[PDB]
Amino acid sequence: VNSFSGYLKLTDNVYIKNADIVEEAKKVKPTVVVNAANVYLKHGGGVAGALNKATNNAMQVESDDYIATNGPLKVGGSCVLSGHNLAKHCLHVVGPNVNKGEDIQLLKSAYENFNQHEVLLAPLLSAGIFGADPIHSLRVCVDTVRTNVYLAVFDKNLYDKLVSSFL
Ligand SMILES: Cc1ccc2c(c1)CC[C@@H](C(=O)Nc1nnc3n1CCCC3)O2
């Protein structure tokens, strides 16, 4: 039993809710919140910009030190950093950005990072400003993630389309 509330169950391990991931994280304080990161951990907009804003830019400060030490992530890769006031940890995961021409096949690799954590609060990878089809992202999530994932979808219209079209 966990404290996630109001989710629709899609499969044995995948759950979904129309919610602002920032507000969900502040309420639940999950062990892991997933960020929709880019390889430079520049959290300018989309989910990343919103999560970082909620940390009063502390996420960005920590991320800049991470990059200065380690260099950029790989597309499809991840790193674990602090969750600040939102969660114990933040798993920064880089899905492919279609608006940069990146290989959508890397979306499965991106979701594989979730399997290193027993329970996660997450957005749909590569959705939103990353330009992929969110219906496809949900399909890859369900077919790749085996751990318990609670998906937050900000847009109510999109949430209803994702549920109604789910196979
Ligand atoms: C030609 C073409 C037309 C429409 C279209 C796509 C492509 C790809 C993605 C899709 C989409 O819904 N993306 C998305 N993911 N999170 C959100 N949105 C949009 C609305 C709010 C939040 O829409």
Q: Which domains does the chain have, with CATH numbers?
A: 8-163 (3.40.220.10)
Identify which of 155, 159, 161 to mutate to test ligand 1's pocket (most ligand atoms within 8 A of the CB). 155
- For ligand 1, atom 23, the nearest C-alpha belongs to 133
- How buried is 68 (Cβ within 10 angstroms: 0-12 exposed, 13-18 middle, 19+ buried)? exposed
Q: How far is CA 15 from CA 42, 49, 61, 67, 152, in A?
A: 28, 24, 32, 32, 9
d(CA 13, CA 156): 22
Tokens of 122: 């997450």
Resolution, given in Å to one decimal, reads 1.0
Q: How far is CA 90 from CA 48, 63, 96, 102, 117, in A?
A: 11, 11, 19, 24, 11
